[PDB]
Amino acid sequence: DKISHKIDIPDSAWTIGIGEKFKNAGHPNVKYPMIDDSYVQGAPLGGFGAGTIGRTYNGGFSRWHLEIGKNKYTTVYANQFSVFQKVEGNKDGVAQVLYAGEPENGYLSSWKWDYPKESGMYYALYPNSWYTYTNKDLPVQLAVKQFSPIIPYNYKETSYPVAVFKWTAYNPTNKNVDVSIMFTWQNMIGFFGKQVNVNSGNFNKIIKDKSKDSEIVAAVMGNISNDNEEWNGEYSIGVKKVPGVDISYKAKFVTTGDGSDLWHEFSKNGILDNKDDETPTKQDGIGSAIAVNFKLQPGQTIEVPFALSWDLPIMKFGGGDKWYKMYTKYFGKNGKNSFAILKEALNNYQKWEKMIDDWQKPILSNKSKPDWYKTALFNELYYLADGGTAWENGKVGEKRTNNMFGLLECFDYNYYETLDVRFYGSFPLVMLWPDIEKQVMRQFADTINVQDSSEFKVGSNGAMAVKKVQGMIPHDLGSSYALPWIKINAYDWQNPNIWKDLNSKYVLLVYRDYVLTGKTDKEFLKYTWKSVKTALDKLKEMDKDNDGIPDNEGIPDQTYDTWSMKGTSAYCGSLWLAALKAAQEIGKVLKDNEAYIKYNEWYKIAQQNFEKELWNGEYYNFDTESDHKDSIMADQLAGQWYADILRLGDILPKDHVQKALKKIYEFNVMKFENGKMGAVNGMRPDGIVDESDIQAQEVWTGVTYALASFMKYRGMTEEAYNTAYGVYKMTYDKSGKGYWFRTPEAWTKDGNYRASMYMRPLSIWSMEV
């Protein structure tokens, strides 16, 4: 490996061998079918709302999130980088696809598959990833850095459906070597969203843009139709000419064939026919190829950028709504703009790399933080782009000032912006893209008084219930299978109109967003103030026994949606106390004396009764009325965690919080698989895991990272990082369960999981407040 020296991969990059088999992988631990795409994953490419493409550590373009809200794992075998090399003086060169695998059927049988083991590495530090190729039959060593311009405080480039592939080639030998690198791509129009004749009318064209000192050559892969539909648009791949390289291309090869039309050219001398052909196809799949060829002298290095763009301007949801994706603001809506997006990338990628470096450097250069922590912090952000992210720039047929946004809870539970989850999972948005965060919270504010009297069947008990009650915050903002932003509360396992955490979490999120954007956005507090008051006033009505605290109802009426709480709970009770203190503060900022006085009175009464009802001398009891009411809950003090972040001071005595946190670390962490797997949710005071529900026996990744955050603010530095380390280890480490770029909600003591690709563990960013 002499190529590593020639590029700059950070030490904290996650790394794995190209072609590596992983032995330990976990699987779903639930009864019904659950997504399991295997451990062959990688960092995604694509902006927010663009649709993303997961290129795996083996090289294949395999995890397709181009249909917004859907996860489709299938390798499109024509989509590759390939290399040709010939030592000057030798009769023949060698040609190899850079993919550690081969097609299932006989398509593309002419190409050279099965990139060998122990011949290169994959690295990831999102939004960047790298591959290195160190192969005994490739005398020239190669690496690529790939990325999309995901940039905090930037709402433009961050939206782009584009990826850059910056290649570095180095000749460590004493002979001249001829090298080609070829990017192939299938014309994927009709891959989704087309009911019949999936390739019909697809055609490819070549663009040569020769603006002095800036030749770009690209393929644009589209369809003859000018229709404005979810399926229609264009893909483009291309390359920018640099000194010392020549470009060649082939417009059209058949992907539903043996591939020799292309491969007989490439394998001879690494130079393609430059044959243009815009003939549309009927049944056959087609693709395009772009290649560079160059001679490297001994000791010579060369750098060459390729790019990929996809202009699929319309997203369609299952309920029938069609929306334009955010990036269309910058490139147009007609679906014929892939070349413009590609060109922008090829001409500005250096600038984008520098902008990425500028936002990673403050964390990477901090030598007080261990590498593993850096690995997790950056790579968890994969989910912001990969989470079925929807970001609209107008309804098709319908202009507003705002662009509605949604991030999925996950794909198995297909709900946008699940609020009880986003309480944990929205930290990166508030910290790095706060205009999006504020928009999402205004979306919730606008729903508070919506009343929908139509009925639905509650999954857990079969009872009928009202869809949406006036003054109750919705669970979510719809599903990709139905009508995001339009039909709320897609979730039906429990009735969220009687949840005891949603209204208080809402208020806490409002005040968080004010605090963590510098306590200046008085307009945001004004916009949301009525919804805040309404939310708390409605929750106060659920206090049955007049202790000043809402009563959990002996059913799962909060985020732990199969784990019953009854009476006053530590979890919902602490959130209530914190939310009251937040509303007091807002009342003070907005000079609303009536509200300040009311919420202060409610707070004093509730605080006093919470302490009396739950403090047992060592920790806060789980609740007042359940069978296992004295279980130690990892999340028992969630309200105080948020109160620290919001700078609301002590809602509970310092001495008691410190004792509780130490108890959680001693039991829920250290007595669960020796503290190597996070914080189990529920532990009995005898040191055995609480068995009253599956959720008690799970570690929740987002709960554990948040707990680590809480511990860190309270000066329990070692406990905080040791707690978080188990989540890192299980996700990323060789000794873990292989969940990289699909961090799940939860795992049990055996390491098996529930709900891969989950929003909650984005809470790791709370460790950086």
Ligand X SMILES: OC[C@H]1CNC[C@@H](O)[C@@H]1O
Which residues are known binding-site members for Ca(2+)?
Answer: 543, 545, 547, 549, 551
* Residues 54/136, Cβ–Cβ less than 8 Å: no
Q: C-beta of 572: minimal distance to Ca ion in Å?
A: 10
What's the per-residue H, E or C state across 190-232?
A: CCCCCCCCCCCCEEEEEEEEECCCCEEEEEEEEECCCCCCCCC
Q: Which does 511 bind (CB under 5 to 8 A by kind): Ca ion, ligand X, none?
A: none
Give the strand order in the sheet containing 322-325: 314-316, 322-325, 390-395, 405-406
Q: Is 296 helix (H, G, I), strand (E, B) or coil?
A: strand
Q: C-beta of 544: minimal distance to Ca ion in Å?
A: 6
Distance of CA 385 to the CA centre of its chain: 5
Using CB under 6 A, which of 67, 380, 561, 719 touches ligand X? 561
x/- map, 129-158, Ca ion, by CB under 5 A: ------------------------------
Regarding 420 and contact with ligand X (CB under 6 A), the answer is yes
Give the nearer residue to ligand X in terms of CB position, either 179 or 469. Answer: 469
Options 8-16, 243-251, 347-355, 416-424: segment touching ligand X (CB under 6 A): 416-424
Regarding 547 and contact with Ca ion (CB under 5 A), the answer is yes
Q: Which does 234 bind (CB under 5 to 8 A by kind): Ca ion, ligand X, none?
A: none
Beta bridge partners of 14: 124
Among residues 537, 525, 419, 409, the alpha carbon closest in space to that of 470 is found at: 537
What is the spatial distance between Cα 57 and Cα 61, in angstroms, rounded to a whole number? 10
Regarding 551 and contact with Ca ion (CB under 5 A), the answer is yes
Options 230-238, 279-287, 525-533, 544-552: segment touching Ca ion (CB under 5 A): 544-552
x/- map, 360-389, Ca ion, by CB under 5 A: ----------xx------------------
Tell me the residue number closest to ligand X, measured at CB: 559
Q: What is the DSSP string of 43-78?
A: -EES-TTS-EEEE-TTS-EEEEE-STT--EE---TT
Give the nearer residue to Ca ion in terms of CB position, either 168 or 552. Answer: 552
Among residues 432, 177, 162, 433, the alpha carbon closest in space to that of 306 is found at: 162
Q: Which does 304 bind (CB under 5 to 8 A by kind): ligand X, Ca ion, none?
A: none
Using CB under 6 A, which of 352, 373, 413, 524 touches ligand X? 413
Regarding 545 and contact with Ca ion (CB under 5 A), the answer is yes
Q: How, if at all, do strands 61-65 and 72-73 pair? A: antiparallel
Using CB under 6 A, which of 447, 559, 697, 756 touches ligand X? 559
Give the nearer residue to Ca ion in terms of CB position, either 63 or 712. Answer: 712
What is the spatial distance between Cα 633 and Cα 570, in angstroms, rounded to a whole number? 8
CB atoms under 10 Å from CB of 347, counted, come to 16
x/- map, 708-747, ligand X, by CB under 6 A: -------------------------------------x--
Query: Which alpha helices (DSSP H) does 365-433 contain, by range?
Result: 371-379, 382-386, 419-425, 427-432
Among residues 309, 304, 306, the alpha carbon closest in space to that of 342 is found at: 309
Q: C-beta of 413: minimal distance to ligand X in Å?
A: 4
Helices and strands counted in the chain (H then E): 16, 31
Regarding 539 and contact with Ca ion (CB under 5 A), the answer is no
Give the nearer residue to ligand X in terms of CB position, either 344 or 561. Answer: 561
114: left (phi over 0), alpha (psi -120 to 50) or beta: left
What is the spatial distance between Cα 706 and Cα 636, in angstroms, rounded to a whole number? 12
Options 64-72, 247-255, 459-467, 536-544: segment touching Ca ion (CB under 5 A): 536-544
Query: Which alpha helices (DSSP H) does 391-542 contain, by range?
Result: 419-425, 427-432, 434-447, 502-515, 522-540
Give the nearer residue to Ca ion in terms of CB position, either 412 or 613. Answer: 613
Q: C-beta of 575: minimal distance to ligand X in Å?
A: 14
Give the nearer residue to ligand X in terms of CB position, either 378 or 413. Answer: 413
Q: C-beta of 380: minimal distance to ligand X in Å?
A: 18
Q: C-beta of 570: minimal distance to ligand X in Å?
A: 17
Would you state the structure tokens that stand for residue 24, as one six-digit string? Answer: 């330990």
Regarding 554 and contact with Ca ion (CB under 5 A), the answer is no
Q: Which does 545 bind (CB under 5 to 8 A by kind): Ca ion, ligand X, none?
A: Ca ion
Among residues 259, 273, 267, the alpha carbon closest in space to that of 84 is found at: 267
Regarding 235 and contact with ligand X (CB under 6 A), the answer is no
Give the nearer residue to Ca ion in terms of CB position, either 540 or 628. Answer: 540
Q: Which does 418 bind (CB under 5 to 8 A by kind): Ca ion, ligand X, none?
A: ligand X
Options 102-110, 415-423, 464-472, 585-593: segment touching ligand X (CB under 6 A): 415-423
Give the nearer residue to Ca ion in terms of CB position, either 31 or 367. Answer: 367
What is the spatial distance between Cα 235 and Cα 338, in angstroms, rounded to a whole number? 6
CB atoms under 10 Å from CB of 211, counted, come to 9
Give the nearer residue to ligand X in terms of CB position, either 496 or 587. Answer: 496
Q: Which does 437 bind (CB under 5 to 8 A by kind): ligand X, Ca ion, none?
A: none
Q: C-beta of 521: minimal distance to Ca ion in Å?
A: 34
Q: Which does 561 bind (CB under 5 to 8 A by kind): ligand X, Ca ion, none?
A: ligand X
Q: Which does 1 bind (CB under 5 to 8 A by kind): ligand X, Ca ion, none?
A: none
CB atoms under 10 Å from CB of 340, counted, come to 14
CB atoms under 10 Å from CB of 661, counted, come to 24
x/- map, 484-523, ligand X, by CB under 6 A: -------x--------------------------------
* Residues 131/18, Cβ–Cβ less than 8 Å: yes
Distance of CA 743 to the CA centre of its chain: 9
CB atoms under 10 Å from CB of 365, counted, come to 8
Options 77-85, 247-255, 546-554, 718-726: segment touching Ca ion (CB under 5 A): 546-554
Which residues in the chain precede a discontinuity of more than 2.5 Å between C and N?
398
| Cβ contacts of 565 within 8 Å, gap of 6 or more | 500, 552, 554, 556, 557, 558, 571, 572, 622, 623, 626
Q: C-beta of 472: minimal distance to ligand X in Å?
A: 14
Give the nearer residue to ligand X in terms of CB position, either 126 or 758. Answer: 758
Q: C-beta of 642: minimal distance to ligand X in Å?
A: 17
| Cβ contacts of 133 within 8 Å, gap of 6 or more | 3, 18, 83, 98, 119, 120, 141, 142, 143
Q: C-beta of 575: minimal distance to Ca ion in Å?
A: 14
Regarding 513 and contact with Ca ion (CB under 5 A), the answer is no
Q: Is 688 helix (H, G, I), strand (E, B) or coil?
A: coil
Regarding 421 and contact with ligand X (CB under 6 A), the answer is yes
Give the nearer residue to ligand X in terms of CB position, either 422 or 581. Answer: 422
Options 260-268, 347-355, 418-426, 667-675: segment touching ligand X (CB under 6 A): 418-426
Q: Footprint of Ca ion on this chain (CB under 5 A)? A: 370-371, 543, 545, 547, 549, 551
Q: Footprint of ligand X on this chain (CB under 6 A)? A: 409, 413, 418, 420-421, 491, 559, 561, 745
